[model samples]
Target: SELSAIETAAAIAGGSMTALEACDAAIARIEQRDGPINAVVVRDFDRAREAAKAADGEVAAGVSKPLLGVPMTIKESIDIAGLPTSWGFAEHADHIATADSVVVSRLKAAGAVFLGKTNIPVALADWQSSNPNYGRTNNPHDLTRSAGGSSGGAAAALAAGMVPLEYGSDIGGSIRVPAHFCGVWGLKTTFDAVSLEGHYLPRTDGARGELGVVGPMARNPQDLALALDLTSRIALPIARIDTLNGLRILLLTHHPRAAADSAVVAAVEKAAESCAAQGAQVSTSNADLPDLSKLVSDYTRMLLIVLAQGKAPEGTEPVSLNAWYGMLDDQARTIRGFDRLFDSFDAIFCPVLGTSAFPHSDEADWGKRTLTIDGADTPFGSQLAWISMATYCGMPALSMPVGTDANGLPIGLQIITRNWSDHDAVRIGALVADALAA
Candidate 1:
């Protein structure tokens, strides 16, 4: 319930504490705790101390920045000059960045001290955070459980209390899943809402990616909101709700493709009922929700193109240019449908991933792996249905932990809002967070 980055920055700016002390404290925590977690595969403590010293000087000289003096880590996929940006690919293990990414520069400019980069799965292509280059990252709750991938290590770092903040990217629930599993807070910004200037594949530069978004992950929603203000390239208009009172919530649990555990479902319902208890109108069902099957099909098709580019991955056929464009049209239609739903509901409350953190599976082929939801084996990939709705529609969704399941694993409830209304989603998350805290 504590605000991490904000309080940390406030102490530094007010001269109540020094940035060097904060950075050192964070480094000590990581060195002491991350050995078994494997979340912080990359360590930059030496440079971090230098940055902290500089931040202390800035604070003494009257500099005031949103994240000033706050120490944090980033997903390994992002560029930070002099650090490796391999995205966990072993062949690109020697790929070190020469320039700081746009967001990295922005965060540095805002006075954040970079602790280092976190780990990710190979090419960031799976839900479990394991790769040949970085090994595997385990959930803080259970050593054997997965840390949720791509951005899994980013979330793990926050959950382990090693860092006050983190920068992570999401495409295929990369950001949200980890937050869901780790009991942290994450935002999947509306597509293109944040700059993608420096987040490209290793040594192979290209245009900004499709269906991919970079955003903040934090232990608290207030910090997530503050990070948004600091990182957004374009000013996102905030239709401030301030609180959930009198707001309308659309609760989604059923997915045409995957079954969520009852505990997960109950956790989300518990959040909705909490909102209702606080005077918000909460609906457990929606009659006009878009056809999820069609949406998932279209979303999965575009995802393939985004991941594979023009070249097809092994065992999968690539769609022609015409087919790709048609899927874009399909996505547009789906977004339009979601737009209409938002007219009747202020937000969509639901689970981020199908279930809590499952045991780590080393299977490289997602197609070959199976996921057990509600004790039934299902196509491992179908659980994506929970996230594809927001991802393909390019909507803003904030994942925040509402409660723990029977196993003491956390259950995250997503506050999904209309596209570009990212601030609103964070606002809703804070409201839910307050209820959970109560």
Candidate 2:
């Protein structure tokens, strides 16, 4: 059951279990539960079975691979050779990839099974998973609520036991939000920690720079680490660290301007208490934060510029650098003013979203829609505020389930590490997970 990507690899290498066994188990789970969840958009059962059989044979003969025989699903937006790279957009329904995205190829080479593609939003622009091409994905905990999007389906599939691991990309909380809503674990690795050479929406003149990252989503923290190591091509030893005894952690008591529900705050505090109990130094002071408020405007400006470059809103013209600069001025002041806040801590824990999942809607225009938070009507865009800090600074962040709220909705806590400290982020996450379990 959740043999974790690393544990599965070790078991296969040690000859305790064959790669084929793991593949069969994953396939069986998908066949049994996928009918209700619809998480696996496409299936390559025959190919996966054959790959698993070959991996088992190699292991029997004393050969071992990095991720040998592990099973995982890829997000539809990411190109998997011979699979449709639609990104849920009907215009690109015929877009078949000739080669696997760099990350996909790496996973396959490590002996991971290609369980087929998961679902995504059209153009992967929204926070919810529904697209005109593929139907909406529901939450595993409560089907009535949304699974969270762009990577929502991926998160749900993992939570429902459909797959051991899932691949997802995040820009604007694509990975973190769903993981939060669906009661699972996700990681937004450092920007470029994993190469995006084959990512579907290639970095062209119109592509958003430094805002998107492909990462792993899974039921447990170890599985997330396993996916990160394989996808990012990081050496195994470095990804699986032993301890977090000296880890310096900062708990963000003051949430961003976005509305954070009581359940969400409680969940974060529970996680903080767990960390403190584990002997890690935890503090709530904003001593090092220069300007916490500016993150929202800064993140939104960059996001708008990137979005405008790709496909400007029908009546709007592309924003100019001067406009971007003007927008950043306020953001820069906030971040620079609060820059010292991060000087003393290795990581900051915050919320992914204030509330749990919401109902599915087919509203075409987002501007006309309002997402109710704390019984007060707020702009749908406000939901993005929780994710702005990491995006604005391009820091590595990890999201893991702390506990469920009163409504049975899962709550996730965000761990933001300093720039390029991807390993440190994972290590701290694993420690917290262990502590919570204890």
Candidate 3:
């Protein structure tokens, strides 16, 4: 059986286990298993032990909180007072942070004991976690493949059973892609659903970012929902949809810019068929959906504008204020279009990426990289269209493992719901995962 944060907390609270025991067990597992994966790159066993001891006292005194004494790991991009919040920069490797990020502070307040900080790509930019400071993080399920980055190490640790709950951030599939590759559950909480005070730029004064989000990852859906609510500063009551029978659904597997691998498409079709078999009202198409071709340009234009801060690169032109506002205008219209579609459907399902865990790639320039999807080389950047659906519109999404492909690589699916219906997406997504299971 896998370790679960929800069950751990309940057991600790009920005196079936002590917080210190839980902490030590997680630490020991990391020691025994992490040498091969190198996921939780930063270790804080002593402090985690101390916090766990304190948590035991809290339990003894009958103080109950949602995450009291639960052991977890945070993305390295997030600050934790003395920990190095390196976004994989070798220049400032020793630049220790002096304060707890708001996300860290809130998690601590809710009684979660952090095991340590995990690894990341330089600038938290890549889908592979390999940097000069921490080295490459191999996929725990298969050491030769990437674990998925930005939040690579977080997903790796969760998949390896080193930690039950994880904190991760995303702008371009950082959180969801890792979960997709690592075979875990990750929630891209509704943008700004949780504060971004702690997860930020390297060695600089920080504010919330555009097209970015910080959220949780776990092995199970209940733990994901619990951790999200505990840190969200917003009550996202986990929607408990008892059945998918008659639930309106839409499945999207192809994009104008990118093609899904046969394995990914098969997973989508399998999931759609399963939902239909359960009596859910499933549709293979919907005309109300925005033209994905335009969304590709709009999301890219706006995303580039946001990433470059109006100072686009050599080939791209810097945007005028009017053009920037035009992008926002289109985004609003796109959101409205999606809202109309969701009015008719309960959820939309799609691939998290075009493919699964790929061989380790160290290409720094995103434009130069290529991903082999079903043996056909594809532009690595165009895969953003899959993630851009919820990300561009600021809607909430959940990534869950559907099943593995023929080669045994985990295939993950993303289920997206209307904005602020984060819990609804999660609840229905969990049901679909069960249906899609082999």
Candidate 4:
């Protein structure tokens, strides 16, 4: 049901498929299949066709590149020259990017064709990708369920085989949740590892936000790895382990604040058990790991301030200078704690979130939103704790599909590695997936 970006490139390079042919086929798929999903919000088929023609010319001229003529989409928040980058806000519906983002420029250099931008939530503030401008993106597996945002559209498009690759960002599980919901692969790189020059919030292009990062989402791990290498500012380290045998894994199936559904926990346990049976040394507890309770609390507080740009709400007081510094200190301690934990554990396996794709809701206030976990109503925002560890401590985490739930929706597992171990997380995740399948 899906295509491989790596094989697509090899095919174009070997003359089995022309760049224009591949581009046209993807466009056709998007046209035929994306109508109900509404994932590809902004279409740039005219320019993409022209670019594909030019790529064919280059291929004929013997020009070689890693992603030669490969077609893909970017999250709506990422800038593409001459395309609208509205983050689901109606006010920014006409905001046209004058230049390609750093990631976009790098992908183009690698011979990727920018099909268009995918849909995102308003201000990218929620997990469901629905906005005033682009409407909503539905799960390809079950249209009634959410396509998990703010990268929901990217995952939906990929699941439907409309595109082979995507570029997305994550702060509150934006990239990871969508992959979890739509049954795909995503990597949330260590913070600041990829440039965020053109991934600005609504109506402003400015400095990078804290706890936010740019990364790749694709159908498989190899495509994600290629995109990471092509976009990173510095050379990243390779995976430390060649196979799962003798690999040290710290298994975490639950979070202090989040109440995971039984299905989610079971999927994670199934993977951990599979790894253990395959010669991986899986441990359920580690003394050196940071305090989970404190990490979640600190991360949520800091995330609110960052999202608000340090401005308090109408009734609340602004954060003091002392408090701000204290949080920074805590973050430093958290980073060091993870570094020490990695001394014994090569990776941490856990659920991507508390549950699978949920039904659409109309609630505007997050405080009032509720998710049903294990058949009981639970607070909606508590799920953020699952993704906070990687974002708060600047660690690399890869979210990959493990199994399907009762509804046939995908359940995802995250493989988190130490800081700058971006390649290791993905490579380990790829092998874990193989083990699970075997």
Q: Could you tell me every candidate's TM-score relative to the true structure? A: 0.97, 0.90, 0.96, 0.98
Worst 10 residues of 2 by lDDT: 201-210
Order by lDDT, highest first: 4, 1, 3, 2
Instruction: Compose the digit string of candidate 2's lDDT tens values, residues 1-438.
Output: 556777778887887888888888888888888776777876878888888898888777877777888878889878787877788877777778878888888888878878788888887887778776678788878887888888988998888887777888888899999989888888887766787756656322133255788888887776766667767755533543355555567777455567777778888988878877867678787565744555676677678777655456779776766776676565556555434655777678888887777777677677876776667877777778788787766677888888888878888899987666677677788788888887
Across 131-160, the per-residue lDDT of candidate 3 in tens digits comes to: 999998989878999999889999999999
In model 2, which runs have C-alpha deviations exceeding 4 angstroms? 14-17, 202-208, 233-247, 310-317, 321-339
Q: Which ten residues in a row have the lowest lDDT in candidate 3?
A: 233-242
lDDT of each: 0.88, 0.77, 0.87, 0.92
lDDT for 80 (candidate 3): 92
The parts of candidate 4 lying over 4 Å away from their true place are none
Candidate 3 C-alpha error for residue 394, in Å: 1.1
- The candidate, 2 or 4, that scores higher on lDDT is 4
Worst 10 residues of 1 by lDDT: 1-10
Query: Candidate 3 — what's its lDDT?
Result: 0.87
Give a tens-digit lDDT track for model 1, residues 263-288: 99989988998888777898867766
